Design a protein around this ligand. Structure first.
Ligand SMILES: [Zn+2]
Ligand SMILES: [Zn+2]
Ligand SMILES: [Zn+2]
Ligand SMILES: [Zn+2]
Lengths: 522, 522
């Protein structure tokens, strides 16, 4: 390629970038300097300061009275804005320096220069996808569903989650040394951990008899289908959940059920095993063609190792471009994946159900206590968390909303506002250890507000976020015996035994009043 | 009488006491020096030290080789032991000094002297009442009962409570300046306050309509009957409860119901009113013949005023006997009352019910909150408490026991272990604001353990003493949704949601586990 061994001054890297364009605007046949610089520059300096360098360059060249260097500069900038919009949307300082530059070239007001650097039209066209950027029919019931369907929709989820990660996110993860400041990756983490805990809690959810290990079998089948779908990350998630200490400590279940599977589990462990370092996975992933998913944990370890290996600035005082080239190559290799869409089966109701299923935040100790409570007496997804991910009430409230809307459209049959409690129980099976205190309008029928209650309570326990609809409460002295409409329990005391809602007259303990799940207009 | 103006040395008061006896043992025709000394001596010195004076006297007289002075001393002592046993039972130091004296006269072993001072036989005869020291038929239902019956049984109660107070108790109340060390008076206090609060809570207990003021009328009638029965103390209690600020603040009830009564209430207030000082009550009580009750509050104020007026020891260095005479006269006047038994109607089941009804310990603020909750917007029994009386779990546990046994014998009809919930509700009417969380063996029938539960919970709330049968509890992680067998409410949390009983498998919140009312052998 174009060659820098000891590297080069940042000023000259910029100069080269601009000189890759010509007065007519055409771009050089070899761009890789543009690519590497425009993508990686954020490690040496901020994009604001860089743009400022370009501005000093522009004022200079305009004062030199050369239309060609100005035009080239503007074409370079236009290319920056057009080819990476994301950097501009996310970065505030960059956008403000862009407005500054625009107002500068407008105040000077020389012809086409202004037209070339406009953000407005590009921004307009970017938000311009109103439409997304007869299917098939699947069921929301976990008890009867096929492991391939589960693996498929989990792969859809994981793939979207991955796609959300961008070049600049990897760059940011490299510069900040793993802060949760950058959301996309955190969401992928939540998704992985959530899948693991979903597996573990789903196994523990079933009653003491055989059935738990039947669920075990079913998740191992899901794992197989994930393997054949070449989705390695969620594969690591489900196996990592099946191999966890709390699930591994159930001997009765292990002893109950079949061998072929245990052999398969051995195979999945040995495959996914971390013997230094994940070489089995490295070669497995090597033979994979077309659609694939990275297990981005080890790849991020690779990125970090690369970042720490090479010095950012060289001892010569110049910029080390070997580093920027290497990181660009690795990150580009990763982003490359998101171009190929998954083979199959987009169904968004099941997606809604799973996105809600998979929001789980639990202590290891809690799960050990459940597992131990059920049974009296090492393949690690990590990606080691120095900090655990935390839940966002907005995405979870949307999740519940979408879940309700979907279970409504699918299973209501336009019949009343209700669905049969049998089908509901079957859907509930897909939510481990989920229960909500309520009393029902009809026997064997569930209101929309009632199911919203159930899922809101479920999500409230799962995310460990107490949340509920606002009521106007007033501390009330109850003269006749009365019970909590939230926790279904007696209000103790002589006086001031609870809180009454002014408008709807709902009765609650002080503890239950903030977390009440039902609406005030009852 | 025998005359001391400036009073006399304690040694000489003792000498006189002994000299009132003769060698043959016969007692002087005028004893009042014996009476006053033997009763009141505890204010100048303890009975132990006094007995020790008698012992030095005995050793001295025996060494003087005079059989008459020894015999007289022994006869005096025998009279002390025989005529006041209570002083000897209650006082430990006295009893031990008595054993010392007995072992002394036994070690010297001179004839009859030992026989004369023996405590054993007197003690034997004192405990010797195995029998108490066809009636009539009354009902345990408050809704239909006659004000005269209520006033009658309340008078029985108050009279027993009063009888419990002894000479030495008044003396002790005089010396310690009102410490709750002496129980009998404290019990009378509890009884008065309990009656007041029973009145107030009974009025507040009924629903918002007219009926509360009907109960008001009924208590005013009870008050009238108490007046005609010449029972002034509980009269003061019930009127004092009817005139309380919390009951007086109900205007709707006042406006609802009749005048003749309000005139009568005016009469009861003006009578019982404290205009200095209670002269109306003084003359009312003056015209009273035979059976009467003191309103011992003002009389104790009289005793205190007497005690503070006169100097214990005179400036001459001698004992002021004017004081001892005055206090003896007043206290003797009081004790005199307990000799005449009340005119009527001993029924111990209703007594059991009332003794349990009347154990109440409430904050003024609590009752103000109930009264205020029912109604949105000065004749004082006191006897001012610098310290409020506190409940004793033993007497309350016995109370419940006796209550259950009585409601069992009376209302069961030897039919199953159950009584109808209608009759039970009617009995419950007599316990204001009383409720207990349970579920029942049979619809419309109540177990003996069930009613024991109800009354134990009622008493637990009333006395503000949490109490319950012991279970062996173990902190339990519940895998399936479950509810508190005590508070009838949901057990929150992922893990460690409650406590399970090892033997009977009872489920409870941590808060409910100590206060569980049912037995473990279920
Ligand atoms: Zn509650
Ligand atoms: Zn409300
Ligand atoms: Zn409870
Ligand atoms: Zn038990």
């Amino acid at each position: 390629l174009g060659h820098l061994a000891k590297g080069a001054s940042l000023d000259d890297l910029i100069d080269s970038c601009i000189q890759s364009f010509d007065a007519d605007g055409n771009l050089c046949r070899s761009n890789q300097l543009l690519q590497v610089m425009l993508t990686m520059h954020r490690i040496v300096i901020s994009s604001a300061e860089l743009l400022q360098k370009v501005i000093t360059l522009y004022k200079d060249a305009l004062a030199k009275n050369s239309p060609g260097l100005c035009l080239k500069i503007c074409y370079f900038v236009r290319y920056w804005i057009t080819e990476f919009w994301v950097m501009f949307k996310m970065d505030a300082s960059l956008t403000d320096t862009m407005e500054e530059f625009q107002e500068l070239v407008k105040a000077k007001g020389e012809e086409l220069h202004c037209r070339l650097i406009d953000t407005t039209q590009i921004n307009a066209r970017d938000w311009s996808r109103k439409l997304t950027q007869k299917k098939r029919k699947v069921s929301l019931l976990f008890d009867h569903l096929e492991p391939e369907e589960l693996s498929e929709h989990l792969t859809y989820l994981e793939f979207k989650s991955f796609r959300r990660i961008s070049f600049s996110d990897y760059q940011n993860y490299l510069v900040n040394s793993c802060v949760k400041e950058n959301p996309t990756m955190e969401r992928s983490i939540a998704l992985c951990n959530g899948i693991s805990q979903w597996v573990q809690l789903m196994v523990l959810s079933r009653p003491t008899p055989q059935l738990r290990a039947e669920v075990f079998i079913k998740f191992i089948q899901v794992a197989q289908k994930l393997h054949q779908l070449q989705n390695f990350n969620t594969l690591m998630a489900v196996i990592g959940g099946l191999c966890h200490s709390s699930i591994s400590r159930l001997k009765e279940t292990s002893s109950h059920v079949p061998h072929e599977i245990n052999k398969v589990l051995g195979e999945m462990t040995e495959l996914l095993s971390s013997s230094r370092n994940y070489d089995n996975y490295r070669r497995a992933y090597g033979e994979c063609t077309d659609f694939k998913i990275p297990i981005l944990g080890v790849h991020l370890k690779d990125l970090i190792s690369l970042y720490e290996a090479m010095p950012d600035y060289l001892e010569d005082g110049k910029v080390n471009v070997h580093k920027l080239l290497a990181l660009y190559n690795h990150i580009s290799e990763l982003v490359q994946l998101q171009e190929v869409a998954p083979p199959l089966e987009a169904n968004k109701d099941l997606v809604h159900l799973l996105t809600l299923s998979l929001d789980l935040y639990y202590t290891e100790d809690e799960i050990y206590e459940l597992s131990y409570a059920r049974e009296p007496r090492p393949v690690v997804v990590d990606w080691a968390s120095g900090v655990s991910p935390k839940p966002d009430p907005k995405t979870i409230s949307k999740h519940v909303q979408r879940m309700v809307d979907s279970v409504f459209k699918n299973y209501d049959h336009d019949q009343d506002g209700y669905i049969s409690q049998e089908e509901f129980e079957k859907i509930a099976a897909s939510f481990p250890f989920s229960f909500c205190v309520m009393d029902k309008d009809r026997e064997g029928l569930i209101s929309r507000d009632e199911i919203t209650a159930y899922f809101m309570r479920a999500s409230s326990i799962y995310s460990k976020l107490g949340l509920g609809f606002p009521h106007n409460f007033q501390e009330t002295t109850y003269l006749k015996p009365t019970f909590c409409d939230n926790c279904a329990g007696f209000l103790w005391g002589v006086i001031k035994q609870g809180y009454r809602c002014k408008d709807c007259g709902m009765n609650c303990h002080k503890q239950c009043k903030d977390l009440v799940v039902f609406e005030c207009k009852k």
